[PDB]
Amino acid sequence: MALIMTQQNNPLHGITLQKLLTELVEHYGWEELSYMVNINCFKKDPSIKSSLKFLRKTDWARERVENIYLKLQRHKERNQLE
């Protein structure tokens, strides 16, 4: 969708883990994720659905993934005032 959402509304004001990790694979990739999170998962059978389930069981890894998305946010276009 080239049509960008030019609205003052925030359609990303509450992103879930599933969507979050997917965007990390889209904007970074499995390599960066596997390097920042010291585990053999993103470098083992690169699968979104599998990685999600792994983050559910290995909770601390999930918390790392969220922090990785925050790394993206502090480099991404910061929404200005109202």
- Identify residues after which the chain is interrupted (C–N over 2.5 A): none
Residues 6+ apart with CB under 8 A from 72: 23, 24, 27, 28
Is residue 39 in some structural domain?
A: yes
- HEC secondary structure over the chain: CCCCCCCCCCCCCCCCHHHHHHHHHHHCCHHHHHHHCCCCCCCCCCCHHHHHHHHHHCHHHHHHHHHHHHHHHCCCCCCCCC
The domain that holds 68 is classified in CATH as 1.10.720.30
38, with CB counted inside 10 A (0-12, 13-18, 19+), is exposed
What is the domain range of residue 26? Answer: 16-75
Is residue 2 in some structural domain?
A: no
Is residue 63 in some structural domain?
A: yes
Is residue 24 in some structural domain?
A: yes
Q: How many domains, the chain? A: 1
Nearest to 72 by CA among 33, 44, 38: 33
Is residue 71 in some structural domain?
A: yes
Is residue 25 in some structural domain?
A: yes
